[PDB]
Design a binder for this molecule. Sequence first.
Ligand SMILES: O=C(O)c1ccc2ncsc2c1
Length: 119
Amino acid sequence: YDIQAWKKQCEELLNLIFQCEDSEPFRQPVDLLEYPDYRDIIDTPMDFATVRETLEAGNYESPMELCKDVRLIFSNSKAYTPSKRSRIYSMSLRLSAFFEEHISSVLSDYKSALRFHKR
Ligand SMILES: O=C(O)c1ccc2ncsc2c1
């Protein structure tokens, strides 16, 4: 029932993500010199360094907010991909499955802690 535990759990999950080879295209903002039409397709860029920085700055109030930004990394990859069989998109799918598998308990524990607090 620790309402604050999600933060360190998210820091650790981001550490695992940064170790994953599948995260390399998503660690920093998409390079506009390599993908010049990127902002024609994608309205809100997102990357894992921005998520980690937002978390470390104390600018997430809940793990749901962090989860929305991470999910935006994946939806941006799906929207930008020229093919659902592309290398970078395939990396995003694997990384999304890994993230979803790990974030589920973080969200559950946080929501349970909040409910216990307001009981
Ligand atoms: O060139 C591609 O296939 C491709 C697909 C998705 C994606 N997400 C971030 S950069 C990027 C490039």
